[PDB]
Amino acid sequence: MKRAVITGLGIVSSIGNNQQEVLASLREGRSGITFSQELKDSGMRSHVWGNVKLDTTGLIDRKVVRFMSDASIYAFLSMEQAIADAGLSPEAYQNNPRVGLIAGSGGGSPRFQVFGADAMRGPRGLKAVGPYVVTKAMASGVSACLATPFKIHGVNYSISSACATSAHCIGNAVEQIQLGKQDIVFAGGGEELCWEMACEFDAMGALSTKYNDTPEKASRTYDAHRDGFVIAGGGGMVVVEELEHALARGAHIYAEIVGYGATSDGADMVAPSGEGAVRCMKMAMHGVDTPIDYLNSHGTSTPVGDVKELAAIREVFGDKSPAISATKAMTGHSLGAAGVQEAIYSLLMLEHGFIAPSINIEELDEQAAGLNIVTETTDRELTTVMSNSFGFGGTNATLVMRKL
Amino acid sequence: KRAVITGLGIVSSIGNNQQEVLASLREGRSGITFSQELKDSGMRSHVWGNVKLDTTGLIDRKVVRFMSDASIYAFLSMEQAIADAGLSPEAYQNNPRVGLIAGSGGGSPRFQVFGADAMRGPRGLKAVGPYVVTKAMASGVSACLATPFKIHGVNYSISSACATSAHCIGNAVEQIQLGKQDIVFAGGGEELCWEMACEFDAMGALSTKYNDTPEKASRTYDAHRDGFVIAGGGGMVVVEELEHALARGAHIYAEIVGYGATSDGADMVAPSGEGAVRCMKMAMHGVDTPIDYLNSHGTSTPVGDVKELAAIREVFGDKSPAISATKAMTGHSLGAAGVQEAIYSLLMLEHGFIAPSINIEELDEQAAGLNIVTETTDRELTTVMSNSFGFGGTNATLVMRKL
Numbered sequence: 066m067k068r069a070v071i072t073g074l075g076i077v078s079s080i081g082n083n084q085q086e087v088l089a090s091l092r093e094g095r096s097g098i099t100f101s102q103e104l105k106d107s108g109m110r111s112h113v114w115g116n117v118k119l120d121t122t123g124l125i126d127r128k129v130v131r132f133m134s135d136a137s138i139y140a141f142l143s144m145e146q147a148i149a150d151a152g153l154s155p156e157a158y159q160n161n162p163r164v165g166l167i168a169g170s171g172g173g174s175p176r177f178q179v180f181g182a183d184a185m186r187g188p189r190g191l192k193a194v195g196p197y198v199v200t201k202a203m204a205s206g207v208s209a210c211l212a213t214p215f216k217i218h219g220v221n222y223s224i225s226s227a228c229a230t231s232a233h234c235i236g237n238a239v240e241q242i243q244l245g246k247q248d249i250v251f252a253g254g255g256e257e258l259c260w261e262m263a264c265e266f267d268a269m270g271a272l273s274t275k276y277n278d279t280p281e282k283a284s285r286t287y288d289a290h291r292d293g294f295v296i297a298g299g300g301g302m303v304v305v306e307e308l309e310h311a312l313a314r315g316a317h318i319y320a321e322i323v324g325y326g327a328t329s330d331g332a333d334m335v336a337p338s339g340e341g342a343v344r345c346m347k348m349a350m351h352g353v354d355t356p357i358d359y360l361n362s363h364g365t366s367t368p369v370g371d372v373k374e375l376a377a378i379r380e381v382f383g384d385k386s387p388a389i390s391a392t393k394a395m396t397g398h399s400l401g402a403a404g405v406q407e408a409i410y411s412l413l414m415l416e417h418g419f420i421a422p423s424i425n426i427e428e429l430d431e432q433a434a435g436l437n438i439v440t441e442t443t444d445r446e447l448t449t450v451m452s453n454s455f456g457f458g459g460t461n462a463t464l465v466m467r468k469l
Numbered sequence: 470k471r472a473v474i475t476g477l478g479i480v481s482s483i484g485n486n487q488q489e490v491l492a493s494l495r496e497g498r499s500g501i502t503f504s505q506e507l508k509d510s511g512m513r514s515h516v517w518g519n520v521k522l523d524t525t526g527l528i529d530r531k532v533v534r535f536m537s538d539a540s541i542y543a544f545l546s547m548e549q550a551i552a553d554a555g556l557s558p559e560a561y562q563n564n565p566r567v568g569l570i571a572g573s574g575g576g577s578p579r580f581q582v583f584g585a586d587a588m589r590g591p592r593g594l595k596a597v598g599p600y601v602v603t604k605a606m607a608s609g610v611s612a613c614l615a616t617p618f619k620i621h622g623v624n625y626s627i628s629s630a631c632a633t634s635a636h637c638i639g640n641a642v643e644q645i646q647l648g649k650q651d652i653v654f655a656g657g658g659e660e661l662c663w664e665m666a667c668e669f670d671a672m673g674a675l676s677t678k679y680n681d682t683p684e685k686a687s688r689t690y691d692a693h694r695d696g697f698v699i700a701g702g703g704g705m706v707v708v709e710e711l712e713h714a715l716a717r718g719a720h721i722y723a724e725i726v727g728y729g730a731t732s733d734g735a736d737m738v739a740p741s742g743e744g745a746v747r748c749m750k751m752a753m754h755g756v757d758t759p760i761d762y763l764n765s766h767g768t769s770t771p772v773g774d775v776k777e778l779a780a781i782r783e784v785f786g787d788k789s790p791a792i793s794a795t796k797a798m799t800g801h802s803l804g805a806a807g808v809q810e811a812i813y814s815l816l817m818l819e820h821g822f823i824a825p826s827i828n829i830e831e832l833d834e835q836a837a838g839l840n841i842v843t844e845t846t847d848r849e850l851t852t853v854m855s856n857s858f859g860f861g862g863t864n865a866t867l868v869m870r871k872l
């Protein structure tokens with residue numbers, strides 16, 4: 066089996082439009098959460114979100130962007146960044162059977178799905194719909210919209226697994242390398258931000274509703290007064306590359322993907338079982354001869370979910386648990402984009418030797434006792450980092466990344 | 470490590486189990502009907518491949534409450550596959566070596582739209598209810614099955630438009646090859662609704678000239694084809710590691726001996742041909758038996774049909790296999806097409822026949838020379854190929870061989 070490394074990255078998020086801006090927000094413990102007039106206007110109870118603060122007008126060519134929803138736009142721009150950051154040029158990655166793309170969203174595009182239906186029911190029907198809704202709204206929008214303009218010839222599909230989507234995308238990319246089928250796979254995803262989708266999470270009571278007057282305090286993972294997650298949008302993309310291929314071209318290598326866990330609860334639809342996560346982390350830690358220095362938790366800021374993961378971490382590690390922070394307290398929950406963005410946050414912490422703070426803990430949950438939850442930015446020489454992604458439907462992903 | 474198919478299940482326009490499907494295939498029987506729903510919506514295409522089954526009460530209330538139609542069809546298909554594979558609950562449930570990879574092309578446009586419509590009404594959130602997320606999310610098909618079937622292994626959806634459930638099967642094979650799983654349930658489902666259908670109609674992808682004769686609308690390779698006929702349904706196969714299957718005395722349909730997965734990197738909604746050539750060649754690597762039958766993607770589109778035929782010619786030259794497009798009978802079930810057509814191919818393999826490519830009244834001149842079978846033909850088959858090409862230039866091919 067071949068080894069897989071990360072040789073580039075790109076990110077559009079609530080806390081930065083590139084890796085430099087994101088690095089700055091992580092070290093500062095800056096919140097990306099703002100009041101949303103759009104959410105309030107729709108009749109929602111959650112009025113806060115992790116929005117992308119970027120004018121994307123003119124950033125993608127007219128004939129390319131016409132097929133794209135926001136999830137695709139966010140993923141495309143991240144992919145541009147990742148290509149450049151990897152030091153890759155068209156002659157190397159384009160029209161190359163051994164270079165692929167695995168990237169998805171959790172929701173596709175509810176916005177253009179609803180636009181399509183709204184337009185169809187109006188007096189102009191098909192003519193008001195137009196010819197571009199399928200590529201905007203289909204579940205595989207994110208992969209279809211990137212593989213075509215980037216001239217990808219290798220693998221091309223999307224993995225969806227709700228909150229674990231882009232973490233599974235990365236892990237499947239690793240498998241492509243291990244099987245010797247691909248030299249490079251761009252892995253990640255994107256997620257639009259809109260009332261059309263967010264109202265679905267509000268109607269199940271999943272979103273924070275009590276902190277709308279103080280938007281930066283709404284997302285408060287592990288705080289005893291958390292009341293659900295803060296919904297976010299954005300994209301992320303990493304370049305997953307075979308080790309020898311990377312070394313031979315003098316690539317910059319952030320880390321090796323040394324562990325990939327993928328498991329299922331087989332229990333509850335919208336609540337974590339715990340034992341699924343335990344098995345997932347163990348799978349990711351298998352054969353890894355170094356300790357986990359830092360854990361970027363799934364920790365979405367939900368009453369049951371936050372502490373269920375903690376109980377799982379305690380089971381896996383015991384007394385000697387790693388430093389833990391939940392960056393969703395800063396960023397919000399970008400759903401399908403969460404896995405890659407959080408793999409990137411963890412890689413920036415690995416690369417730059419620090420731990421981002423788990424913010425908005427005004428009163429630590431009684432069930433979080435005895436663990437190392439890092440609440441202020443602390444410089445440390447990290448070697449091996451772990452990222453957890455647990456989604457609706459009991460789907461679990463865990464990534465372990467280590468310096469070479 | 471080797472992967473075999475040990476069980477199958479299907480809910481399609483041409484049958485609600487493998488026996489009804491078998492009969493439809495041997496008979497060249499159309500599953501296409503007139504749709505008042507598509508007509509009422511303002512569409513130009515008024516034909517569809519509908520599931521002729523009322524699914525009310527077939528799934529536990531507390532389980533089906535989270536599900537859209539795509540998930541319902543896949544679930545029912547999975548029950549059949551479990552039973553067909555002879556797997557007790559103790560064999561496959563609460564088992565880390567047993568997984569599920571199943572997707573849809575579209576998620577649930579119906580419930581995406583319902584949520585937004587409900588929210589804009591006088592009841593807002595209380596009308597939306599707590600179930601729309603699991604229904605509308607892109608991973609609904611996997612999420613809604615993994616849980617009630619007590620799946621402990623892998624649990625996610627591959628999505629790639631028309632190639633969706635084909636990549637699901639191929640990824641399942643990879644899980645076996647890597648030694649991570651002993652069993653993976655692989656397949657997909659797709660709902661059938663104007664919400665999604667009108668999007669395909671608005672880009673001109675759907676057939677519109679044959680609404681008075683619904684059964685003649687889907688007509689792959691016919692000179693007067695005018696687009697595909699939308700369909701819904703589900704499929705599921707049991708992908709199983711060989712030694713595991715042999716040990717428990719499983720009935721094996723075939724081994725998956727080849728899996729191609731490529732990208733066009735060309736056009737969004739038109740195929741390049743080039744990518745399909747590479748996909749089929751990739752599926753044929755190390756396969757030294759001839760292809761006895763090819764189940765084409767063949768959707769009944771002017772450009773698409775002959776683009777795939779050209780790719781077949783380039784791959785096979787003057788050794789081109791027997792070909793039929795079962796979509797002329799079934800319609801195009803999108804995310805469910807890959808697994809359903811693998812199942813049709815598996816049925817032809819098991820029962821020694823070639824299903825007809827129907828409704829060819831005038832063979833396209835670009836299809837001249839080729840062995841497109843238009844009549845049910847009894848034949849001993851050994852090795853079969855099935856193609857799936859989706860929008861976004863995404864390609865999958867599966868090659869299956871009798872043991």
Ligand SMILES: C=C/C=C/[C@@]1(C)SC(=O)C(C)=C1O
Pocket residue numbers: 228271294330333334335336337338365367370455456457458459460
């Ligand atoms: C099995 C379902 C997973 C549920 C989790 C823990 S995953 C998630 O994002 C949120 C908000 C939850 O409640």
Ligand SMILES: C=C/C=C/[C@@]1(C)SC(=O)C(C)=C1O
Pocket residue numbers: 631674697733736737738739740741768770773858859860861862863
């Ligand atoms: C990348 C474009 C693929 C297009 C194909 C061949 S895939 C498909 O289902 C239909 C109807 C087409 O026209």
